[PDB]
């Protein structure tokens, strides 16, 4: 019963060590049309409702407790890797959707370590301070290298000064309050998560807001005896749950 498969359109995930599917806020995106839009929505596009499987990161002995990587949504699937979903998304003002995700990562019975895999609403994805404007850089891009924790998680100011704290502060000591699962090398090679649609509004101006973030963080450092397979990746299968599109138009050039 630790053996499971999940199908979505012409795609299918599969695992022999599952520990179940954690469903955030105890509920899922039902694909309802937004009461804020007059135009009949475009929805139920089989071609767009599947698992897009991609690379997340390389886990090494070097990474420490609370080092992490942030994956923004829908943004990370808004371009090429998003196939028909990204293609349709790029041509609509508004999008409203949930997410169903499977994070993959295997090692061995002789390896040690553990990951915190979770999903959070309105989680800071900014990379750095843009020299000049006093604003962040690449908010909507996925981390391409592990991120070091803040000893004192007080966030990031752009005014080039220090003191007190910023509203983008994220206190890792409490990260387990977010919908999540733990990926423990001795127990399981996969985690399964799911989240509903949440936001400051009935539907989203996606083009300018990454309302949900998929975060993978290290809890206990990777460890292995010499001779043991040293190369360990972390991949993920991401699926848009009942995406609903409104405000059709000429195409937003993500490119």
């Amino acid at each position: 019963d630790r053996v499971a498969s999940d199908k979505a359109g012409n795609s299918a995930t599969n695992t022999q060590s599952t520990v179940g599917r954690l469903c955030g806020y105890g509920e899922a995106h039902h694909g309802e049309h937004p009461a804020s839009c007059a135009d009949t929505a475009t929805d139920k596009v089989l071609a767009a409702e599947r698992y897009y499987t991609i690379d997340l990161a390389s886990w090494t002995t070097t990474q420490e407790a609370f080092s992490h990587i942030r994956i923004p949504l829908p943004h990370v699937l808004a371009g090429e890797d998003g196939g028909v979903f990204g293609a349709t998304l790029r041509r609509h003002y508004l999008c409203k959707t949930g997410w169903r995700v499977q994070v993959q990562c295997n090692a061995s019975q002789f390896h040690a370590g553990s990951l915190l895999v979770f999903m959070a609403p309105e989680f800071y994805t900014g990379k750095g301070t843009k020299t000049g404007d006093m604003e962040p850089t690449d908010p909507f891009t996925m981390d391409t290298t592990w991120r070091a924790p803040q000893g004192a998680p007080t966030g990031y100011r752009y005014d080039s000064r220090t003191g007190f704290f910023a509203m983008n502060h994220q206190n890792q000591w409490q990260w387990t309050v977010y919908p999540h699962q733990i990926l423990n090398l001795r127990t399981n090679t996969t985690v399964d998560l799911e989240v509903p649609y949440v936001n400051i509004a009935p539907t989203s101006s996606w083009t300018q807001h990454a309302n949900w973030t998929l975060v993978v963080a290290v809890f206990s450092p990777l460890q292995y005896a010499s001779g043991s397979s040293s190369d360990v990746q972390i991949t993920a299968s991401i699926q848009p749950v009942n995406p609903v599109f409104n405000g059709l138009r000429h195409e937003t050039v993500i490119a």
Partner: protein, 230 residues
Amino acid sequence: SPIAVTVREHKGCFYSTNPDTTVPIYGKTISTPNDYMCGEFSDLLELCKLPTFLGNPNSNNKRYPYFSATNSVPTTSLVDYQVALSCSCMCNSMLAAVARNFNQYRGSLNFLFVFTGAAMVKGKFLIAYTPPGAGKPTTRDQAMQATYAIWDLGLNSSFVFTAPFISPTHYRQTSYTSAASVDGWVTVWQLTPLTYPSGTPVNSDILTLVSAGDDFTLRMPISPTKWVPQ
């Protein structure tokens, strides 16, 4: 015996919008009968649905109740209204005049076009509504990808075009108070050239009016930044 009372911190205070009445000093006064009157109304909202004129700017920059078209297909758009109550070509329509006294709106805007060129003239136009996200359209081709309708000239003189209420939020602010500037654009293009016979005025004028559509509502009564007529 007297009733003991706790006097609240906010005493003696006056409220411009206090939900209650005050003391009457000239009671039992009959209000001069006006039962003969007609033309009465209760909701400012209705005034909003009465189509009134859009102010279209000229090169020397002066306004007209309309725009012109002719025997050609201008590579660019003929006119373009920015769906935004605050917006200026509407500055003087009843719709906008009412809207500026309220903080937020919801629903459809209706753009009314009336062809006043000669009976002998023909042609077709492409009216479109483009939501934000990909920037404002720069070509009929692009516009054609958003919400649109083709307007064919003929016996019937006019056309009612509805700019749909497509939005992230249940409501929208009525005013350009700081800067997200707009909620998309309404653009008018020639599909086919105005065609006609010899002996006919080559340049036809199309009256342009705007009004609140059926779905439409306003809320939260407020004051506009004070102004002075020219």
